[PDB]
C-alpha cells in the first residue's frame, strides 16, 4: 500500500548511502512482524558498503539471536564472499561490519563461521580475512570452544585449519571434551597419504605450544606417532621439542 | 636494506571524551517503606515485549522507554 512506497524510497537511499542519520523506518526493522518481506523491498544486494555496516549495527543490538543469525546468513555473509572474489581485498565498511557482528557471538558463529567452513568452497584468502577478526575481538570461553569442537569434527580443508589455529591462539582455558576432539582431528591424518600444508603443522604447533600441560601420556605418545608418519623438515622437530619438555596436569 | 630513521613528535590524545559514570542507579527506581512496601517512582512500560520490569525515563515533560522507543506527553 503506502508502506511499500516508504521502503521503495529508502531502497534508493541505501543504494546511494555514505553517511549521516538514516531514516527512522530502517532503524525499526527487527521490531517488525513481517521483516523479511520489508527487507526484500529495500534490496540488500543493491546496497552500498557503508550502508551494510549500519545495517549490521542495527541487527546486532536489537536482540533475538535467531533473527540476527538469519540476517548474516542471507545478506551479510554472501556479500563478504562476493567482494573477496571480485576486489581480492575486502572493503573497509564491510570489514567493520564483521567486527560489529561479534556483539552477538552465538549468531556470529552459527551464521558466519560455521556455515562458511561447511560449504567447502571457502578459499584460503576468505579464511584469513575473516579469521583475523577473531584474533581482534575477544570471544566468550563457552562460545569459543563450541565453534572449535565443530571445526575439529568437520571435513578437512586448507581454509579450515586457519580458524582452528587462531582460536587456540587466543589461549583460553579449554573444556576437556574439546581437547579429545582436537587430538582425534589431527590423528585422522596419521594414515593419510595426502601432502599436508604448512598451515596444518602450525596449527599442531600452537596446540602443543600452549596446551602441553593438558595432555595425557596416551594421546601424548599418539602425537609422536603422528609426526613420525607425517614429517616436516622445519616444524616437526619443534613439536617434538615441545612434547619432550612438557609437564602434565 | 637502507633503514628509515623514525621521527619523534608528541601530540597528546590522552584527553578524550568519556560519558559520565552514574553510580548505583537502582535506588532511584524504588522507594522502600519502613514496613516493607515497594513504591515505584517511574512509569513502567506497557509494550509488546518489554513489560513488567523495564522502566521509562523521566523527561522534563514526558516519559520514554529505553528498549522499544515509546514516547508520550
Amino acid at each position: 500500500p503506502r508502506v511499500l512506497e516508504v521502503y521503495r524510497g529508502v531502497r534508493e537511499v541505501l543504494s546511494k548511502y555514505r553517511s549521516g542519520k538514516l531514516p527512522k523506518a530502517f532503524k525499526i526493522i527487527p521490531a517488525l512482524s513481517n521483516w523479511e518481506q520489508i527487507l526484500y523491498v529495500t534490496e540488500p544486494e543493491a546496497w552500498t558498503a557503508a550502508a551494510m555496516y549500519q545495517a549490521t549495527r542495527i541487527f546486532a543490538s536489537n536482540l533475538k539471536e535467531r533473527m540476527a543469525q538469519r540476517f548474516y546468513n542471507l545478506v551479510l555473509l554472501p556479500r563478504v564472499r562476493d567482494d573477496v572474489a571480485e576486489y581480492k581485498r575486502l572493503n573497509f565498511h564491510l570489514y567493520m561490519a564483521l567486527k560489529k557482528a561479534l556483539f552477538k557471538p552465538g549468531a556470529w558463529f552459527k551464521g558466519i563461521l560455521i556455515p562458511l567452513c561447511e560449504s567447502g568452497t571457502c578459499t584460503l584468502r576468505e579464511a584469513i580475512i575473516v579469521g583475523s577478526i577473531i584474533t581482534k575481538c575477544s570471544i566468550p570461553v563457552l562460545h569459543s570452544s563450541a565453534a572449535m569442537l565443530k571445526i575439529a569434527e568437520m571435513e578437512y580443508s586448507g581454509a579450515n585449519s586457519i580458524f582452528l589455529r587462531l582460536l587456540l591462539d587466543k589461549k583460553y582455558a579449554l573444556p576437556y571434551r574439546v581437547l579429545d576432539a582436537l587430538v582425534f582431528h589431527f590423528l585422522g591424518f596419521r594414515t593419510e597419504k595426502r601432502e599436508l600444508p604448512v598451515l596444518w603443522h602450525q596449527c599442531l604447533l600452537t596446540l602443543v605450544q600452549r596446551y602441553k600441560a593438558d595432555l595425557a601420556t596416551d594421546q601424548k605418545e599418539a602425537l609422536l606417532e603422528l609426526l613420525r608418519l607425517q614429517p616436516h623438515p622445519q616444524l616437526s622437530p619443534e613439536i617434538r621439542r615441545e612434547l619432550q619438555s612438557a609437564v602434565p596436569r | 636494506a637502507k633503514k628509515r630513521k623514525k621521527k619523534s613528535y608528541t601530540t597528546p590524545k590522552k584527553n578524550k571524551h568519556k560519558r559520565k559514570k552514574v553510580k548505583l542507579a537502582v535506588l532511584k527506581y524504588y522507594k522502600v517503606d519502613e514496613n516493607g512496601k515497594i513504591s515505584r517512582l517511574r512509569r513502567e512500560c506497557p509494550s509488546d515485549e518489554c513489560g513488567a520490569g523495564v522502566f521509562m525515563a523521566s523527561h522534563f515533560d514526558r516519559h520514554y522507554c529505553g528498549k522499544c522507543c515509546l514516547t508520550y506527553c
Binding site: 503506502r2 508502506v3 516508504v6 524510497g9 531514516p23 527512522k24 523506518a25 525499526i28 521490531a31 517488525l32 512482524s33 558463529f109 552459527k110 560455521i114 563457552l142 570452544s145 563450541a146 565453534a147 569442537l149 565443530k150 582455558a173 573444556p175 576437556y176 571434551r177 574439546v178 581437547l179 579429545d180 576432539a181 587430538v183 582425534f184 593438558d214 595425557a216 596416551d218 594421546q219 599418539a222 602434565p248 596436569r249 | 515509546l70
Partner: protein, 48 residues
Amino acid sequence: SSVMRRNEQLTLHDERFEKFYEQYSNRLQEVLNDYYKEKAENCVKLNT
C-alpha cells in the same frame, strides 16, 4: 566422542554443546508519518 581423554585432575566447567550443533501495527504508522514529515522539512518552499 573420542577414546583417549582427560584422565587426571579438576573439572571446573561441564560445557554446553547441545545448543550449537542441535540448532540446525500502531507504531509502524507513526514512523511512516514521521518519514514524510522529515521529507517535507528538507525543502521548505513556504516559511517566513
